Amino acid sequence: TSDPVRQYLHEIGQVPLLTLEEEVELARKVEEGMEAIKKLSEITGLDPDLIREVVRAKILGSARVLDPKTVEEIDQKLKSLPKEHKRYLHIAREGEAARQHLIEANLRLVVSIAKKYTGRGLSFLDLIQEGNQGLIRAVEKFEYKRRFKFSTYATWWIRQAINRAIADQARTIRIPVHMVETINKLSRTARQLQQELGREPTYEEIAEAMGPGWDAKRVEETLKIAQEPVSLETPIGDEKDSFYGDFIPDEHLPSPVDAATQSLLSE
């Protein structure tokens, strides 16, 4: 009942894995469905994204909630094309189904990859969901003609999605991706120079070890901007009665003395 990790693991485990034949077939169907959909778009003259969306909506069925009017009208127009063209529509349907089946079958690789990123500011389920997004990207961009296995191309995209999500959402005050990478490089360099030096290095050492364009003031500013905020509800003392925010005075509102001074000054 509880513990959503167990529920998600069971739901992924209810889908059997794939062999080479099934994987290659699914990749072929997705690719030919994309080719067929662009062929339909060329024949009808409409936007490819819209026909992709209507085909996907008609496949997903009523169960999944552009309104039904446009989807029905364009579908019926699509079901009006003469022969040798509607075949493309059928191939597009099969390709979309193949894409869904491929993602559903390869979801477990996402969990396997994401299970090694815990303790970095994101919960387990968030890492899995971002890995799923990366898996969707890899499925969409995968090219089977190279005879390579799908997981080899999928792992890179899954890792990219997980890393981007960690860089984007792990901090209360958002720091841009390049600055986050700079902080990580600073930390790595400082750690290596700590181990080597047998003591914590001073800022000049880190500045020298980063390379040209780095001085001690820049290192200090970078470590200052890397500070994370503390909680106003941090417990102080053993008893459950004192919080950190209880010791912070308000400096915005004017004090009674200040207001009286202003009123007397106005008078």
Binding site: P4, Y8, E11, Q100, I103, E104, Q129, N132, Q133, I136
Partner: peptide, 24 residues
């Protein structure tokens, strides 16, 4: 989580992924 759910809905993701996100 709301933004990721919206993104996943706009991409036609399978129903298992969407169910997980809605639970979250």
């Amino acid at each position: 989580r709301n933004n990721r759910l919206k993104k996943l809905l706009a991409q036609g993701a399978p129903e298992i992924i969407i169910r997980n996100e809605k639970r979250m």
